[PDB]
Amino acid sequence: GPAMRIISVNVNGIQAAAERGLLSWLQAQNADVICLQDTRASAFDLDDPSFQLDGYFLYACDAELPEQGGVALYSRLQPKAVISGLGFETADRYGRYLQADFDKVSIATLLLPSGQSGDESLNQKFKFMDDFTHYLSKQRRKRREYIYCGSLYVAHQKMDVKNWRECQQMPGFLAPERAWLDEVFGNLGYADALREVSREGDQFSWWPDSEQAEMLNLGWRFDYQVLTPGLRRFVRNAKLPRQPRFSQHAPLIVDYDWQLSI
Ligand SMILES: [Cl-]
DSSP states (O other): OOOEEEEEEEOSSHHHHHHTTHHHHHHTSOOSEEEEEOOOOOTTGGGSGGGOOTTOEEEEEOOSSGGGOOEEEEESSOOSEEEEOOSSHHHHTTTOEEEEEOSSEEEEEEEOOOOOSOHHHHHHHHHHHHHHHHHHHHHTTSSSEEEEEEEOSOOOSGGGBSSHHHHTTSTTSOHHHHHHHHHHHTTTOOEEHHHHHOOOSOOOOBOOSSHHHHHTTOOBOOEEEEEOGGGTTOEEEEEOOSSSOSSSBOOEEEEESOOOOO
16 A cells, blocks of 8 residues: 655765765665765756666755855656745755645655854754744645655754753754744644654764764664644654664654655
8 A cells, every 4th residue: 555755864075975975875776766965066066967866856945155065855746846945045046845745745855054153053953943833834825735855953842852850951942942843843733754654763863973882872863754633643654764874864764654656
């Protein structure tokens, strides 16, 4: 019966990640759609034939200054349409959004700023958040379903971070950041794909770049597949494997009881 697999990875530079084996690992995962974030590549850079995956169409969107963003989406089916951007600057100037439309459902790749390099960067992250809330408050009135493969740089609940008491003071688990996700998953009615099938802790998707973070698992769950409520009962499995990886982020692999078509 019906099945679809969607894999989402923040690659922290698609060339750096590819040099680490990302593409041959993806080729083998049996994904219907792959969503990448933070490619750091220009449209011309992504024209390099070694980024193509056999059996997949590849779409991308680049940041004005390519290193500041970029996202991409591979699909086995040729989507009905692909659109980029969200209609606000902290997305559109940074290639932080791209969407593929299928029958009844669109699947997107979404990237936020991390807000980790000072107050200016955190201002930019809060503004993106607020503008994205506004977009979702309108979009939830549409009839089609959406799967937002999102690299959010925000962990929602205590179980989504290791040592929540120290994290509370750092970008990623600030009170207004947790509040934003409470709004997304609460009043706005969206679903957290992994949380529809698992309430266990110790499932993280990002680690600072240090051997001590790696040995002690000082991880944060920053990567999600955020769902329209019509898809919430279709989730089958979700996994954030610690290995292999290609960046500071783990891949998020989610299977759904849904037969993708165009
Ligand atoms: Cl906010």
